[PDB]
């Protein structure tokens, strides 16, 4: 069955338009005015911004609207800000099935200024080593673009195993956070000069270092 | 001939449903006598309002609608066809997609639906306003 | 103030049962339709089952039919899910929504927090808190747990400025990971007592570590 | 028992004048039903008010003046001693510089004279209350 | 819009008369306590003469008791200042004021824009109105008249932005003399016809001069 | 009989706060609280600021403040403003006298900024030359403070006879404007090289000087 089919990304400029399309069926979309466009951050609940397939819901401005044509619904964005960089997901009744949903979509807003990221860098704990292991912690924030990759480095020379690298998460200054974490046992931290964390954001590299012998 | 005033009635309103209200204001508009009417989810008046109509005599109009007990987006308009000291008759429309309000035959004032007009239980007419008529009446 | 709080997630085994609560405040419940609305990881909403306000007529989407059972207390403002026969397709965060309705044009007004479940042959596993010691960052690093979620407060939640929490990494070995820092001032540190409140539902751990400098 | 909604009596107030008023609101609290009480200088009630008390039950009161037609600085008070779906006793007490406003016996607004309370003509009660009371007594 | 309006004032030879209106509109002038009030040149404010809502009650300064009569016209919205047997001291602009009594703690809110009042044994004299030639400058010299005052308006009131009519001189001679000047855009010279209307009531002189180019 | 006796004059600095005293008797002031405010502006009708001794009239500030002890009222006025420079006269009922006003006072606010005089120089038009008549208009507009000296010059040499010059007078943008005239035969003002206004403000001069021969 042909689901509410969304562009999986799109991107507009900051101060500008952009429209998000929902491509549904004769049995959802071109059924009735029963449409309606959600808002939501990963890990937080979905928001009601239009419903009706073209009324605002409380306290969404009119830069925000929506209207349909035949079975595709369109989701339009105007005077593009910041917090607009989110996922989008529309929404209809469907004959005998309730209310579908569309994929989502992920808005990027282009045009923003570029903020290099924040790192700290943390040793094992002293804790962690009587418990026989050791984990450097890399903590990556208030980056823009949100896109960044980590490498590492005992001593001078690069080291690939044992590093877990999370995915960019978007943060309340609308800047987006990350982090890596390397695991070594007690007996290669305490034998090597030093560890680093390298962040390259948009071709700039951020490096943080840590001794033992601190 | 006079109805009361809080005036509350159960209502079944769809695509067709006018509801007539004849009436006049108990103050001179200086003194901004008000008139209310609220289409109802249930019969208790502290229920959710579908529909509010909010005349400030000689002033404005304020339509509304209150839902999860909150009042939402207020649209207003300053239409005034109502005339000071003067009996009026208010008719209110439900079309497919809004409810169309006449006042004395002339088309006044609109308000889109925000909730199903099915979902309308009790109609409540109140405020500075005496009633003489208040007439359900259906065109298919 | 309209409140919605889901509650019963967790870790179930393949083919076993799991009850899901959300309790409503702030709002005149027994008036209202309500929703179960679902998200798998890296997925979209999926509308899973809905009831009217009295709680007589239900509705279920095909992939759950005949597994669980929408209910509803009217005199506790209670929505209840009774998921049976559950399947590792079940995984996700469970939201309640409200009204979801054709009289409200299906719309959803109000949401949830929303509850985690998930649907493996795996046990739970506690994790291990480690203090991440010293404007001044500090933080606590919470290790190889499952499933999510984790919650992590400070001073028993007295201390909420300054605090970025970071989403966990899902590291290879199938245990997830996080760090919680604190920026306080550097003026603070021997004066005030630092501890991160770290709570894991699933396996019922509750660790409370002081972070102090080195 | 109950007496004509909106009341209209003439008057003569002066220092140690007091209006009782005993009444009820005519809707629950959340759809904020209004008590107005305006004290005029003539019979007319598009005259001047000298103290015009307004109630917005559950939210407000506001106090003011209507002087050459025009309505003055507002006083706002968010003190509310009147009890959603009550019977409520209101008095006001004519002071030398101020009335003094009583809500089931306990002092709860004041309104220094704008104008001398012997300019006052007429006393007006009205808006969604229904009323049982309205006595004007005196002490010297 | 509330407005007080008097007329009537002028020269007067000693021992004459005069009678003053002062058209009320915009409120109920019949509910309403009314009263003159006069300030000499040079001078200090002084209550003349109040009169009742009604009519029926009156009272007079000390210094025109028996010389002038308060009346008003409630049907024509008037009040009136009969002035008889008037003296140099008289002399002064005439306010209408309102409400001046008792109940309204003897407060004015209200006053009209005033009518000049002169005593003298001297001839009005009408002024000569000559064009001073011109962003650019231009304007009207209006020369000795007597008594004040003149009023001075450009292109019949149509003209309002950019004018300055500068207080007269009261010269040796005992004859007034002012000036008025416009502020216009040096492109309007030639397109644009600049006319300073000139009025002297006293003498009920009436000069329209067009101002143009050297 | 003793009259409401205020100071001519008072001082305050823009931003602080002065007070006005208004000297009465037992019969006015000291009788009743029928103690009027107003402010004025030479050739405008009194605006109410006060009545009953400390009630503030329609749209006057807090910063307006009455009151009075014994026989004497006070009118203060906090954060001192450009507008603030007037005149400002007390009212009172008068056993058997309706109302008796003060004297007035001329407030000064000190410390604004110093504004040199604009001045516009015109020369006798061929109108007034025509009527064997010359008058040279010296228009001098925007200074601050309100006060300034004119001189006049036939050539290099100083002219005294025919020379009128107004008081200053406050304008629109609450700075001050002053004209002066000076009168010649129409042989005077053909016989010299040119003529001079000179405006002296806080001891700095400006000139404009106009010639026949332009
Ligand atoms: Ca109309
Ligand atoms: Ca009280």
Redesign the interface.
């Known amino acids: 069955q042909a689901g509410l089919t969304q562009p999986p990304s799109v991107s507009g400029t900051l101060g500008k338009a952009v429209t998000i399309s929902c491509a549904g069926t004769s049995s959802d979309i071109g059924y009735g005015?029963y449409v309606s466009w959600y808002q939501q951050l990963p890990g937080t609940a979905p928001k009601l911004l239009i419903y009706?397939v073209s009324?605002?819901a409380?306290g969404v401005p009119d830069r925000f609207s929506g209207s349909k044509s035949g079975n595709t619904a369109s989701l339009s964005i105007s005077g593009l800000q910041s917090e607009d960089e989110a996922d989008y997901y529309c929404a209809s009744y469907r004959y005998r099935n309730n209310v579908v949903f569309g994929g989502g979509t992920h808005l990027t807003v282009l045009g923003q200024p570029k903020a290099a990221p924040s790192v700290t860098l943390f040793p094992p704990s002293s804790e962690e080593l009587q418990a026989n292991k050791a984990t450097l912690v890399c903590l990556i924030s208030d980056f823009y673009p949100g896109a960044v990759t980590v490498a590492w480095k005992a001593d001078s020379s690069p080291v690939k195993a044992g590093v877990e690298t999370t995915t960019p998460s978007k943060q309340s200054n609308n800047k987006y956070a990350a982090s890596s974490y390397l695991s070594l046992t007690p007996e290669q931290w305490k034998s090597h000069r030093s560890y680093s964390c390298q962040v390259t954001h948009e071709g700039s590299t951020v490096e943080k270092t840590v001794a033992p012998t601190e | 001939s006079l109805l009361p005033v809080?005036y509350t009635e159960a209502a079944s309103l769809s695509t067709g449903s006018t509801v007539t209200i004849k009436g006049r204001p108990?103050?001179?508009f200086?003194?901004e006598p008000?008139l209310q009417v609220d289409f109802h989810?249930?019969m208790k008046?502290?229920?959710?309002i579908v529909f509010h109509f909010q005349v400030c005599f000689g002033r404005r109009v304020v339509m509304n609608s209150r839902?999860?007990?909150?009042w939402?987006?207020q649209v207003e308009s300053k239409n005034m066809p109502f005339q000071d000291g003067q009996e009026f008759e208010l008719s209110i429309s439900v079309l497919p997609?809004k409810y169309q309000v006449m006042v004395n035959g002339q088309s006044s004032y609109t308000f889109?639906?925000?909730?199903?007009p099915?979902?309308v239980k009790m109609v409540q007419v109140?405020?500075?306003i005496s009633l003489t008529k208040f007439n359900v009446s259906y065109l298919k | 103030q309209?409140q919605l709080v889901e509650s019963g997630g967790g870790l179930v085994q393949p083919g076993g049962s799991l009850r899901l609560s959300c309790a409503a405040s702030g709002?005149?419940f027994s008036?209202?339709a309500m929703s179960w609305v679902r998200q798998a990881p890296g997925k979209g909403l999926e509308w899973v089952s809905a009831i009217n306000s009295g709680g007589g007529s239900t509705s279920y989407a095909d992939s759950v039919k005949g597994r669980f059972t929408i209910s509803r207390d009217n005199a506790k403002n209670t929505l209840y899910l009774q998921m049976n026969s559950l399947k590792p397709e079940d995984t996700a965060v469970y939201y309640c929504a409200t009204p979801g309705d054709?009289?409200?044009?299906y719309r959803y007004?109000?949401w949830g927090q929303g509850t985690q479940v998930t649907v493996s042959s795996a046990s739970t596993k506690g994790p291990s808190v480690f203090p991440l010691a010293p404007t001044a960052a500090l933080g606590c690093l919470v290790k190889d747990y499952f499933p999510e979620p984790v919650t992590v407060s400070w001073n028993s939640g007295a201390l909420t400025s300054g605090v970025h929490t970071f989403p966990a990494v899902l590291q290879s070995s199938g245990l997830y990971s996080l760090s919680s820092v604190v920026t306080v001032p550097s003026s603070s540190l021997g004066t005030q007592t630092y501890i991160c409140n770290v709570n894991h539902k699933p396996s019922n751990t509750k660790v409370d570590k002081k972070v102090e400098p080195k």
Chains 1, 6 share one sequence.
């Open positions: 005015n009706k009324r605002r409380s | 809080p108990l103050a001179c200086l003194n008000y989810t249930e008046e502290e229920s959710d839902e999860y007990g909150a939402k987006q997609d889109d639906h925000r909730i199903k099915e979902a109140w405020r500075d | 309209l709002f005149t008036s209202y054709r009289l409200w044009y007004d109000y």
